Design a binder for this molecule. Structure first.
Ligand code: ZN
Ligand code: ZN
Length: 49
């Protein structure tokens, strides 16, 4: 029966596969270290400075 609610998330950086990995800094979900160690889509600006 319908008990599942899709208890998973997609990579918010490439939107390719599931975001199995998570960034404890911003709260983003990435599919792997590929999108983790990115500085184009994986933005760590936080504030202006
Ligand atoms: Zn981050
Ligand atoms: Zn990704």
């Amino acid at each position: 029966g319908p008990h599942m609610v899709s208890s998973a998330v997609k990579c918010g950086i490439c939107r390719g596969v599931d975001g199995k990995y998570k960034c404890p800094k911003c709260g983003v979900r990435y599919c792997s270290l590929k999108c983790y160690k990115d500085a184009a889509k994986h933005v760590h600006k936080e504030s202006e400075q």
